[model samples]
Target: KSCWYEEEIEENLRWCFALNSILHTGASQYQDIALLDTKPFGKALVLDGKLQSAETDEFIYHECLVHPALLHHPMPKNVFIMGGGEGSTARELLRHKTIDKVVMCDIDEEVVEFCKSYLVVNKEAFHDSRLEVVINDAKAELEGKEEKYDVIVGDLADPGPCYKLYTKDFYELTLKPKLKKGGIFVTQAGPAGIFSHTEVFSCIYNTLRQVFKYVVPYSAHIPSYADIWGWVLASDSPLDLSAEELDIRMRQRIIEENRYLDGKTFVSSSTLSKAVRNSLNNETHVYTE
Candidate 1:
C-alpha cells in the first residue's frame, strides 16, 4: 500500500539509529538522529533518506568543505581528512591541482573498503594517485605530525560521545601541532544552528575561539544532512578566501568540478530573496561537534 504525500514525507524523514551511524529520512520540524544503511539517498549510503559520507549532500557538501578550506590556505599541498576513510572527501580533495598529497584516516577500515568497492557513485576517488587511506585512530596516528598539514578537514560523523574529536585540548594537541603556521583547520562545526543554544555549538564556537584568530560559520544546502548543514573554518590569520590569491589553475578548477561554491553560494552576501535564501541558508548543526 502506498502512503499519502504528507505521510510519505513524514515516514521518509523519521530518524533511526543503527550500526554506529545516524539516519535522517525526509524532513521534520524536530531533529531525530537515526540509523545507518548502505543506501539512504540514492547515493553511496542513505541510512534513512539522506547522505552520510564524509559529505552528506554529495557535491554541494564536499565542494564547500574542500574548496573554502583549501582556497583559504596559501598552499594546501599536504592535506589530511579525519573520519573520511570512505574516500568521498578524497574524491573532492584530489580535485585541487595544488594539493601534492592527501592522507585520509577513518577509524573503520570496513566502511572505507566497503564504500570504495561497492559505492561506485562516489567515483572511487581514493584510487587517485595523491590519496592515501589509513585505518587508525586520528589522534594516535597524528602524534608526531607537528604542523605538517597545510589544511586539515575533520569530517567525522555524529557518533554519540566522541568527546575527543570536539575537545579544546585535542585541537591544541593534535590539530595545532599538525597545521602549518599559516595553515587552516576546517571542522564540520555542527549544524547551521538547529539547536543553537545547545551546549554543542556554543562549546565548539567558544573552544575554537580559544585557538584560531578567525572562526567563520558557513552554510551548505544539504537537505539530507539532517536538514541544516554548516561548518566552521578557523585559522590564525584573518578569514578571507580572496586574500589567499588563488592562482589561475585553482580558479579554473573551481569553475570546473565545484557544484555549489560560487558567488551566489555564499551565505554572507546572498541577497536574491529572503525566502529563497532562507531555503539555501537553512542552518542545522547535525554534527553537534
Candidate 2:
C-alpha cells in the first residue's frame, strides 16, 4: 500500500504528494508532528498537518528567511530566533562568520529535540558552542531579557496560537524595543501567491509598516509548499541596498554560498506582483491584540 500526504492550501485548494514512507509521527504538547520521506521533496517535516520544510527545497526557504535581514545589517553578531525548532534557521545564521551568538527559543521542547535527533542537515548547528537552545515561550523569554540582538527572526508558523506574536502590540511594545540600534527584524509572513496573498501576507506587511521606519516584503515559490511563500523585513534604519551591493555583502559576510538567495534574487523577490503590491498598498488592517 502507498500513502499520500495531503494539505489544504485553502478551503478550496488542496495539495497531495506521494510519500515513500512515514518515518515518524507523534504529537507535541502544542501540535502534531510528522517526519516523512517523499518521492519528490525528499525528507519532510510537517507540523499541525502543514508542510514546514523538505530536504530538497528547504535551502530556498531557510536562506530567504535568514539572510536578507542579516545581510542588510552592517555587522550582525547576535541573533534571537523565535520558534525555529527545526534548527534550519539557526543553521543559516551560524553560517555567517560575523555571528558570535545565536539564541533559538521555541515553545516546544519535544519538537526541538526531535529535529536535533532526525534533521541531519542541521546536526552541526545544534552542536555549535555559540548556539544556545532555549525551550520556552518566545514572548516570555524576550520579555524577561534586557539584552538586545542585532537581528531578530520570527521563524514561526502561520498565525494560530502564535497570532499574538504577530500583532501590532507585540511588534511595538515587545519586539522592536529589543532590537539594538540599526538592528533588523524579519518574519515568515504566511503566503504571497496570486490568490493567497490576501490571507496574511498583506496584513503582516501592513502591520510591520505600522511599527517600523522601513519595511520590505518578499516572496519565493516553494515546491513543497505549492505556493509563493512570503517574508517581511523591518527596521528603524534604511534597508535600501542595491543588488550588486547585496551580492558584495553576501560574499564578504557569509562563509558558505547560498543555494537560492543572492543580490539579483533578493531584488527580484522584493519586487511584488502588481496585485500584491496593490493589496499591500491599500491594506489598512493592523493585527492588534
Candidate 3:
C-alpha cells in the first residue's frame, strides 16, 4: 500500500516523491489537503496538488517569512497571520519573546487540524498558549475592522484561490487598516526565478510599493523549492539596516539561535540583485481584484 506523489513544477518538468504512508487526505470547503509521509522529506503536505510544506525544510520558508519583518520592527507585540495553517510561521514569530500574541486565521480549519495531528515538527506551535487559531476567511475577518497590529504576515497559497488577497485593492483597503502606525508587513511574494516567474513576482512588488512607504524585495534559495524564493519586507518606517546596527538590535532583543540568518545574512538577503531590481522597478502592472 505505497504510492508515489507527483507535482508539475515547471513547464513539462515534474517532481515526484515516494510516499510510504498516507496520513490524511480530504477536501475542505476551500481546497484539497493531503498529509503524506515521504522518504527523504519526512512529512510532506500537499494543497491543491502543490507542495505547501515539508518537515525537513519548513524552517527555511518559515524563518524567511517571519524574521525579516518582525526583526525590523522596533517592537512587534501583536501579530496576525492571513493563511498559515501549518503553524510553523507562528512558531517562528513566538521565538521573539517580545511578541505577546499571534492571531492565526486560515480559511480552512481542516488543514490546521490535519497539520496539528500529523505534522510532528510543528505540533508545539499549535498548542502554544499565545496562539489564537481562528477558522475563517482572513479576508472576510479583516474587513471593516479597526484593530491594528504590529506586524501582518501572509503565508497564503499561490495566486489562484488567494488572488484577491494579492490585489492592490486588498492592500489599500482591507490589509492596510490592520497595521498599527510604523507597523511592518511581510509575505512570501512568489518564486523569483527570472525566466518563469517574472510577472507574478513583479506584480506583488509593484502592488506592495503602491501601498507601503518602503518595500525591500529579497530572494533566497530554498532547496525544497529547487528555486530561489522571493519575499518582500514592507513598512512605513525605513527598513534599511546596517549589519552592525542589526547585530546590536538583534542581541538587544536577544534574537539568537538562527539556522540560516545572522547579521551578515540579514544584510545580504535585504540587498537584491540588479536583475530583480530592474524587474520590480520597470514593471508597471499592478494586480487589482
Candidate 4:
C-alpha cells in the first residue's frame, strides 16, 4: 500500500522507513500534493535539492520516465503506462510527435483524479487526446492483453521487496504479451543491489532475466529512493544507449528536466557509483519461488 497524508497511509510509501523516518503530513498549500518527510536514511536519498519522493518531485519522476524510454526507440508510436496518473508521465510521453496514443493507468482512481485536477503542474499531459486513463490494478489489467505496444512503461513502487509489480511473473505474463515483437518495456526496478531479499530488486532482476533477452538495469540519482534508484529495460534486443541515434527533440527534453535522466545516465546497474553499489555485498537473491 502507498502511504499518503491520509490516515490509511501504508507500506509502499513507507518502504524507505525500514531503512531510514519518512512521514507524510497532510497537504498545506497544494490541495493535491501532500507534505512529507522524503528522507529518513540521513544521507539525503534525493539529490539536486529536489524532493524526489514528495508530490513535489513529480517533474523529476515523470521526465525521467517518458524521455529515456522513448529516446531508446527509433520512434515511440504507441506507449503503455502502468500505474502513473500524476499526469507527469503522460505529460512527457505526449511530447513525442511520433506517439499517437498513450495509456495511463493507476491503482487508485482518487489519487489520479485529485492529482490531475488539483496539482497545478499536472496540466500539460492531461489535455492531450492521445491519452487514455484507466483506473485499475495493474496486475489484473495487464492480464489477457494482446501484443500491440511499442513502448511499455511501468511506474509502480520503487522495487521494494514486496512490491508485487516488480515480480518476474509480471514481465513474463502481462508485460511481455503486450509488446510488439520489438517493443521495449522500461520500469523502475528497485535499489541497486544484489537481491538482498526476495521482495525487492533481487526478485525483479531474476524474473526479468528469465523473460527478457536484454534485461538491463539503469540507476539514477533520485533523492527519494536511495541513490541506488533503478529502472530496468527488457527487450529481445540488446540495451543500446549511444549518442548516434537520439534526435534533437528528445535531446532538448533532457536538457529541460535535468533532475533524473540524461543520455549518460543509461547504463547497466553495474554503473552505480561504487559506494551505492556495495551497500549490501552479502545480499542473497532470495526472490526464488
Candidate achieving the largest TM-score:
2
Compare candidates 1 and 3 on TM-score and give the better one. Answer: 3
Model 4, residue 81: displacement in angstroms? 1.3
How far in Å is the alpha carbon of 170 misplaced in model 3?
A: 1.4
Any runs in candidate 4 off by more than 4 Å, and if so which?
1-52, 55-57, 144-147, 158-162, 193-199, 247-249, 252-260, 267-270, 273-289
Measured with C-alpha atoms, the lDDT of residue 226 in candidate 3 is 67
lDDT against the true structure, per candidate, is 0.61, 0.93, 0.83, 0.59
Candidate with top lDDT is 2
Locate the minimum summed-lDDT window of 10 residues in model 3.
247-256
- Residue 39 CA error for candidate 1 (Å)? 10
User: lDDT tens digits, residues 162-209, model 3?
Assistant: 899898899988888888998998988888876644847778888899
Query: What tens-digit string does per-residue lDDT give for candidate 1 at 1-289?
Result: 1211111223345543323333333222222222243233433354233346423357777777777787766567888888875566777888777887989987767566556665565554766778888877888778845548888898886435256777767887678888888888887755554343233544565677777788776665566555456677889887664422444435755435455565445544222235433533443332223
- lDDT assessment of candidate 1: 0.61
Query: What's the CA RMSD for each of the models?
Result: 7.8, 1.2, 2.1, 7.6
TM-scores vs. true structure, each candidate? 0.73, 0.97, 0.93, 0.70
| Clash pairs, model 2 backbone | none
What lDDT tens digits, residue by residue, belong to model 2 across residues 155-270?
98788668999999999999988999999999999889987888899999999999999999999999888889999999999999999999999999998789898899999999
Sorted by lDDT (best first), the order is 2, 3, 1, 4
